[PDB]
Amino acid sequence: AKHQIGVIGLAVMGKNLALNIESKGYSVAVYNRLREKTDEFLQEAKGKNIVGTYSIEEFVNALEKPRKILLMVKAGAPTDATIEQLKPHLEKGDIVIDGGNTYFKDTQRRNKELAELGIHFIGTGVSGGEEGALKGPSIMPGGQKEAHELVRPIFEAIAAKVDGEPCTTYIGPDGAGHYVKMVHNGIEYGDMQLIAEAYFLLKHVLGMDAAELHEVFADWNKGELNSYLIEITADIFTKIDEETGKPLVDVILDKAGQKGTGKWTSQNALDLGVPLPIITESVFARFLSAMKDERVKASKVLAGPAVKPFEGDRAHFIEAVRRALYMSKICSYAQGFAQMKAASEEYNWNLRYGDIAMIFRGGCIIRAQFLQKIKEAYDRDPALSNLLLDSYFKDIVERYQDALREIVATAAMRGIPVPGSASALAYYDSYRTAVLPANLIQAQRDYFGAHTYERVDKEGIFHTEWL
Amino acid sequence: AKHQIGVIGLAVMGKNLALNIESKGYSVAVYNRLREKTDEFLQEAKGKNIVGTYSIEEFVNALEKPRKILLMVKAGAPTDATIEQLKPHLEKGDIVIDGGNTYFKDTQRRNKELAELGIHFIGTGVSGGEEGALKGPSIMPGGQKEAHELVRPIFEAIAAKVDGEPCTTYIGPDGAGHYVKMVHNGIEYGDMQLIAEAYFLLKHVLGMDAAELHEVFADWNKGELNSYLIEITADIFTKIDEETGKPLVDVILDKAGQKGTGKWTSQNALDLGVPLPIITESVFARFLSAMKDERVKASKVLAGPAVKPFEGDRAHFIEAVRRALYMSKICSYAQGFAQMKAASEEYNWNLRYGDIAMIFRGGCIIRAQFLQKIKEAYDRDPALSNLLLDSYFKDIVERYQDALREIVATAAMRGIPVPGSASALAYYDSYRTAVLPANLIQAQRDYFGAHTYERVDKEGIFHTEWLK
Ligand SMILES: O=C(O)[C@H](O)[C@@H](O)[C@H](O)[C@H](O)COP(=O)(O)O
Ligand SMILES: O=C(O)[C@H](O)[C@@H](O)[C@H](O)[C@H](O)COP(=O)(O)O
């Protein structure tokens, strides 16, 4: 018999997506190199319209033309080796979809190589984790338009929906979807760091235990901060470790891990020439936390300030931490969306930033009502160069900046590190400043490397003989 | 005949090095892919023991064996293309030296490829701008030790000297030299930002004009901040523009350019898992400065804080800025040398940090008295994991931290951007803190992604069914 779509790669992620697809009424053919994974899945999927296949050739010939193939294998060599194995069996107009957390430049290369053979390639971000894949992920496809239209109904049936809108859209050509999935990941790290900072601030300035941290974050999730990450943070602080009777979170080693994918947004921001301080500080902050042994060692030798207990208005401070968090979150998204814009211009993608905010509204980890406000900003002005300039975000920052300045000043004086929040404040004060101190930098570079400069008053290039 | 050393690539950097080599008694042959650069240089080099050659074969045949060839061409494809031109003609035991601003993995590759052929390869950082190349640069070579020994007298002859010692040493195997050169360049970016922030603070908090600013910086260069960058800064603040009667600095457009190599230290830190906040903020600050139009447009619509004029002790604030600047620089170097330690362990380079500190002492842009203190820290402890643990630097930061706190708080309250200095403080506060909020991050990661965590009280990898 002929099946509607094939999935290669049967880890939980691939299995759940194939289950999602089948529940939406499509017939699914599966293949996995490690034989046992297929055997297990077929027992897991009794009664469902999923068939196992046992070679690449069997798999390919079990599918309706034009063929739809979802790769969910290990990044790098195994993905390419599978694509290589598919090539002889596929025909002009067949569609290979890579759904892993792939570096967009890899997707660009595979797209280009397959195209020469008339085979289409879609690199797609899948967000939501393992449960999300089963129930409704965010899906971020990029590749040929003609190929996307063929697979679009499948994407649209399996994605999460907000207000009848599927959390999927055609992102753009080549590696656009994988690019946007990378930025999602970056933004995710920033949010987690900014929240970690709000926690540490409450813990140290106010001496808050887990139970009252629960209350605070639970309240926060009833307002503008409403989001999956805040939601789960409120719940984390309720958990009691049985063995010790301590809050579970206090027993967990403060050594933040990360996949090698974590650093990609920051590294790409550096290539494009776009400032991404908050997300980059967030990545560095994980690295510094992983240096736990160095840190406890330095704690016995390095002195902080000798500050007395906090005696100010406690309710005021809680709210100031909240507003500092929300403003910082805004600067981070402004930096992240400004990155996607530089990428769109550079790779010629014509990205729609309102559409991107729309797919982030559910399914994915950064999902929050917040993403609605971003969509609206781009609805109103598609070519908006920075989210800070939109009237909604502009109102917030003019009202919340006092709270962010107080938090930065207070953290500085009490010895509480707030790398993300501080760089958020510095970014805000740099972006709104017409004349920066880069005139001296420019003067210096000319002085020692005769790099030449431009002037404030005249047009054209200049070079002084300083020496 | 036969000349002692060859130079390929006659941009100003390669011409000056050749000139430099010649002035130390060596005979030099030169070649350039674009013929007119050679003709031009030869007009400039009459009086000098330098000859031009016009093919790669002629070039190679003009050199005494073992051949010593210095490559000063554009990075990437053109370097590789020149190496390819050279390969048919080189003989076993010949030495090619890439003095370009080369990514260290490229050097690693070229080193391997050339080694299989019996040809040695040295990738060398050369620092100090064009005047340094001419008068005395810092030379940071990496490669086969035996090959280095053969070029060592030439490096030592031309390098800058400080108190009789040349600013050059054997860095390590393969790409180690170009790696240290990269980090030097990262550190340079950080120092320039920290200074720019010092400037901007005095300018907006104290209302200093270019005359008061000059004073401050000249008075700083007589102290522990003594350095080339601070010296030229004190100088820059004296230049008046004739056709405006304005300080020239007030007339230069605030868009900081950068070479494509500028981002590399930060990108690599990300690869190695090392915290490099200050240098990276400095790269990003240059990117922000380049966005000049967005900033003017934004300046009309975005609100700053309400600020009364500054009322506190003015001499105190200048000293706080000075101290904030010195401490921040300490944190940046602490970060940058920690990155070198990481790369050394990763690539098995057995880096000698005191030696590196000593060759940064002259020739290169970041040259400063301060480097002696770094050298001494590694004398006391070669295996030192972070400079903040050394008694000199520990004592400085504990003394000056109060100043840095004041400057970060003041900047916040007054709307003055201090990205580099604020990240220095956050870094200090993070590094000295035994228990950071990453416990929450680990909880979150396990909650939504089953990533697992570790516990403070026992060994093992743990997962929680968070939903119940
Ligand atoms: O749900 C998702 O969005 C994906 O599964 C994935 O993008 C993941 O969250 C990141 O790669 C970060 O994971 P770490 O926090 O483990 O680095
Ligand atoms: O002296 C050096 O260090 C090098 O010859 C060279 O690498 C360069 O002068 C700097 O890297 C400046 O870089 P920018 O042009 O980016 O300021």
Side-chain angles (χ1 to χ4, degrees), chain B residues 87-104:
Chain B
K87 287 170 162 177
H89 300 115
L90 302 173
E91 316 193 61
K92 280 166 154 180
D94 282 351
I95 317 173
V96 173
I97 306 143
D98 174 31
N101 282 318
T102 293
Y103 187 58
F104 83 104

Side-chain angles (χ1 to χ4, degrees), chain A residues 445 448 451, chain B residues 13 101 126-129 181 184-185 188-189 258-259 286 365:
Chain A
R445 293 171 77 241
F448 66 76
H451 287 292
Chain B
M13 211 61 196
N101 282 318
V126 12
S127 185
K181 176 48 157 66
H184 160 276
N185 282 348
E188 169 191 324
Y189 283 40
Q258 64 181 280
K259 220 99 255 212
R286 284 199 194 186
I365 302 305

Side-chain angles (χ1 to χ4, degrees), chain B residues 61 102 114 146 173 214 243 291 415:
Chain B
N61 285 303
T102 293
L114 284 165
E146 341 268 59
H214 162 80
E243 68 201 332
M291 287 156 57

